[PDB]
Write a protein that binds this ligand. Structure first.
Ligand SMILES: CC(C)(C)Nc1nnc(-c2ccc3[nH]cc(-c4nccc(C5CC5)n4)c3c2)o1
Length: 273
């Protein structure tokens, strides 16, 4: 099944719950990415329409797959005795937003606006299709350098979206909201908005605002870089301590800092080429 259909490049990276290889489909030469998940390391098992037990990442990616390219395409998946293999789209040339920010330091605001807008569009699409990612960060965002288009990746910490409380959490501590640190309780939308504020701060400052649990709970945001007041306001709003004080996605995208956003293609010519 697999060996025939795909040629395997080197490793692209690995985290908890996954290892990802660069790869090529032999039939069309289409660039792919090949993700392997060990069954013994899966803490959160999903179920398909078929009534078949597979990793949650597969459930979530199937639920969001259609014309929309702000989320990574799941092309195919396989089961093996001890593992699962996911075939995912791979743009070329591409670069991880974590590496991209590392290289450039603070992003100019025009570029941050485009990037953050596209992530917001992506996350809205996820919620629309019933999916909550739970690990929004620079590491889980890819830049298609030719098209200036961003893509959410790694739904291995994700869950079905629900409007009731979540008591489990598998994503990145430093990106997690204060309600999780203190009460091991949160709600999806409000918690995602927090992690997006961490993301925006990362984009405009070159680094994340908080390292320890104590700083997260204090919720005081210091800017080490020149950032506009409109941008500051938005970040501080997303990073409100009390979830109900956080903006909704509509209110984020209607904020004054998010006006006159560049199209992706414009974003590439000015900022990436
Ligand atoms: C832990 C991590 C980020 C490796 N998990 C992950 N899960 N899926 C991917 C994933 C899926 C499709 C992809 N297509 C292209 C990449 C890729 N390209 C360049 C650099 C990177 C590194 C962060 C992994 N990924 C890709 C990754 O990564």
């Amino acid at each position: 099944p697999l060996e025939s259909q795909y040629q395997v490049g080197p490793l692209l990276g690995s985290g908890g719950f996954g290892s990802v290889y660069s790869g090529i489909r032999v039939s069309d030469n289409l660039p792919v990415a090949i993700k392997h998940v060990e069954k013994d390391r899966i803490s959160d098992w999903g179920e398909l329409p078929n009534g078949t037990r597979v990793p949650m990442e597969v459930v979530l990616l199937k639920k969001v797959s259609s014309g929309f390219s702000g989320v990574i395409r799941l092309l195919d998946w396989f089961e093996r005795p001890d593992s699962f293999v996911l075939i995912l789209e791979r743009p070329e040339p591409v670069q991880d937003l974590f590496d991209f920010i590392t290289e450039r330091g603070a992003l100019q605001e025009e570029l941050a606006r485009s990037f953050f807008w596209q992530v917001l569009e992506a996350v809205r699409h996820c919620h629309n299709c019933g999916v909550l990612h739970r690990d929004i960060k620079d590491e889980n965002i890819l830049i298609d350098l030719n098209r200036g288009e961003l893509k959410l990746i790694d739904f291995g910490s994700g869950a079905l979206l629900k409007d009731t409380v979540y008591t489990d959490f598998d994503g990145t501590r430093v990106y997690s909201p204060p309600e999780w640190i203190r009460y091991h309780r949160y709600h999806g939308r409000s918690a995602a908005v927090w992690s997006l504020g961490i993301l925006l701060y990362d984009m405009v400052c070159g680094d994340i605002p908080f390292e320890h649990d104590e700083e997260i709970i204090r919720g005081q945001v210091f800017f080490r870089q020149r950032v506009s007041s409109e941008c500051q306001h938005l970040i501080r709003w997303c990073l409100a301590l009390r979830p109900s004080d956080r903006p909704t996605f509509e209110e984020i995208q209607n904020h004054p800092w998010m006006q006159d956003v560049l199209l992706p293609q414009e974003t590439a010519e000015i900022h990436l080429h």
